[PDB]
C-alpha cells in the first residue's frame, strides 16, 4: 500500500530553508516528477521545485488560515506533508497546463 511511499518520511523531500539556487542544484539530471519543498524567498511562504519535461519548475506554497496550497480554492492542507501526499496522486495540471506531473519522487528517496 501507499503507506510504503517515501513521501511519508518528510526528510526525503523537505530541504528546509534552501534557496532557489540550491533547489535547482539538487534536481539537476533527475527524472521528471522528482521534487522537493523548501522555504520561499518570499518570507513566510514555502516553494515546491519539481522537474517537468526535463526542467525545474518553482511554485509558491501559500500559508493561509485554511491551510497550505498553491492557489485558491486549494489552500486546504494542514501541513506540507499533507500537501505533498495529496499531490503524489494529483497532477499539478489542475493548476497549470504546463505542470502535468505528480510529486512522484522525493529528491532524497
Amino acid at each position: 500500500g501507499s503507506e510504503d511511499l517515501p513521501h511519508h518520511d518528510e526528510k526525503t523531500w523537505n530541504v528546509g530553508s534552501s534557496n532557489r539556487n540550491k533547489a535547482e542544484n539538487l534536481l539537476r539530471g533527475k527524472r521528471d516528477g522528482t521534487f522537493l519543498v523548501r522555504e520561499s524567498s518570499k518570507q513566510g511562504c514555502y516553494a515546491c521545485s519539481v522537474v517537468v519535461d526535463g526542467e525545474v519548475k518553482h511554485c509558491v506554497i501559500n500559508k493561509t488560515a485554511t491551510g497550505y496550497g498553491f492557489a485558491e480554492p486549494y489552500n486546504l492542507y494542514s501541513s506540507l506533508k499533507e500537501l505533498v501526499l495529496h499531490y503524489q496522486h494529483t497532477s499539478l495540471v489542475q493548476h497549470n497546463d504546463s505542470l502535468n506531473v505528480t510529486l512522484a519522487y522525493p529528491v532524497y528517496a
Binding site: 519548475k57 518553482h58 493548476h95
Partner: peptide, 6 residues
C-alpha cells in the same frame, strides 16, 4: 518568478 497556479 514562480509558476502561475490559478
Amino acid at each position: 518568478d514562480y509558476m502561475n497556479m490559478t
